[PDB]
Ligand SMILES: O=c1ccn([C@H]2C[C@H](O)[C@@H](COP(=O)(O)O)O2)c(=O)[nH]1
């Protein structure tokens with residue numbers, strides 16, 4: 001089907017990746033340099049062989065698109081993808097008084113006890129950010145996150161560039177530009193960052209009135225990360241194609257070090273048992289075009305029929 | 317052979333690229349998103365099916381590696397790859413008095429006459445830069461060129477980062493880092509630049525004591541540019557692998573818009589007639605390691621036996 005390349009990417013790593021140790025010394029099977037294409041005219045690449053939550057995908061993209069960097073928008077949509085990065089700062093801080101939460105990363109993984117004190121202090125932090133304004137400002141803003149890299153890149157001369165809004169301008173005016181690139185990799189910030197971006201950059205390409213997109217993704221978790229990353233970019237590709245009035249062409253996904261966590265082998269094997277079903281369809285508010293002022297309701301998924309979801313332990 | 321992927325890349329564009337207009341309205345056959353691998357343990361990818369000048373390749377890389385941005389080093393090695401970018405500034409300038417050289421780009425292409433006045437004022441500019449110091453400083457420095465992007469990226473806080481020297485440090489100390497990336501794409505400079513970089517970025521990968529390298533090349537001239545670009549990166553890959561004491565693994569070459577100029581069809585077809593010969597061998601001064609203080613003599617090419625070179629008109 002249309003997910004096939006995702007599945008070939010996973011088989012390829014199973015019976016061809018060498019063992020590579022990683023940071024959280026879980027170890028991993030890894031290959032380097034891979035590239036898939038999805039033809040977005042054939043359907044939208046949300047995996048059917050397993051249940052991916054579109055809603056989390058949507059809220060995060062829109063959050064990136066509004067150029068927002070503050071957790072609060074997400075929590076408002078019940079999207080917690082980014083909580084630990086914000087909460088970490090709370091924890092490592094003066095105004096913080098409480099159960100030390102040092103490397104709660106692991107220590108909530110080996111300890112049902114601790115993991116109820118954490119999955120609990122979190123519960124409040126999140127609530128605080130929702131309710132206390134000045135709190136959200138201090139703790140819920142993340143600073144350097146896709147939203148601000150795409151929409152407000154800091155110049156050395158103190159101003160801010162809206163790369164993404166600029167490139168779309170150019171797409172309407174010089175469709176054939178070979179220079180239609182958005183980068184999230186800042187070399188001054190990149191040493192002092194908790195997670196220098198995974199999605200290093202992307203490039204638009206237009207021809208025969210179709211828009212394409214290729215993503216350079218430095219590092220991929222095949223099981224957990226990639227099924228999400230594919231949907232965001234594909235969505236992005238559509239929104240842009242909508243705003244510039246083009247048709248959608250392809251989304252190309254290039255990887256650097258694409259890997260499987262060594263303890264995801266069972267799960268990913270189970271998945272390879274399943275047989276893809278036809279892909280869902282994407283659908284856009286034909287009235288609204290300014291994609292920056294786009295809302296949950298303006299974007300919607302048709303005919304999504306996935307296999308059950310698959311629990312996998314997450315790497316700490 | 318080892319060049320095959322280069323040749324498959326060219327066939328692919330011939331009987332599969334659609335026509336895409338470009339900037340210099342020569343037009344072009346283009347595809348978007350492609351990826352080749354060369355296994356550098358099998359030989360060095362300098363095309364044999366056509367005569368590429370290694371020497372120009374070497375001088376330019378070393379120039380990049382010394383972090384130099386001044387034409388003078390190159391001219392000293394009889395390497396003119398970068399002259400028109402420097403001379404252009406001479407021409408568009410106060411201290412310049414002479415035959416207007418407005419878009420000498422084209423106007424030296426349709427005019428044997430003019431093309432002897434230009435290929436002539438050039439002759440002096442170059443000489444001036446070689447001999448007059450203060451001249452070289454004013455006109456022969458290029459500013460933003462790989463050398464300075466790799467080795468002296470300007471921070472917003474006024475300092476300069478040596479990305480490349482930093483990443484090598486990291487390769488010795490955290491071989492498994494998935495973050496070993498050098499970027500040449502600065503979004504503040506990129507709007508105001510004559511030629512925002514083609515070689516947008518690269519990423520190193522280490523495993524089983526082998527070094528690999530993948531290059532994201534936003535835009536490629538298949539006939540003229542790519543046979544050179546491949547050798548630089550492959551060389552780079554070796555020098556780094558030398559300095560960090562690793563073996564060489566692969567060079568992966570990912571493209572965005574890879575294209576053929578519409579008037580290069582004959583030439584590239586002629587070339588596809590030829591049959592690759594075995595690849596040359598690279599060889600490094602086993603005594604010197606600091607690759608920054610590496611010189612022409614320290615690097616050398618064995619067993620290169622190419623077919624004749626192929627004249628092609630250059631796109632203006
Ligand atoms: O959108 C994302 C965000 C993160 N990761 C995964 C990939 C790696 O396993 C890890 C990044 O860790 P480092 O690459 O920085 O070491 O997170 C993804 O796959 N997709």
Ligand SMILES: O=c1ccn([C@H]2C[C@H](O)[C@@H](COP(=O)(O)O)O2)c(=O)[nH]1
Pocket residue numbers: 178179339511512514535536537538540541542545
């Ligand atoms: O190392 C290089 C430098 C330049 N080019 C070619 C590719 C394009 O045809 C052109 C870049 O033009 P724009 O992509 O900026 O429009 O130069 C290369 O292929 N390799």
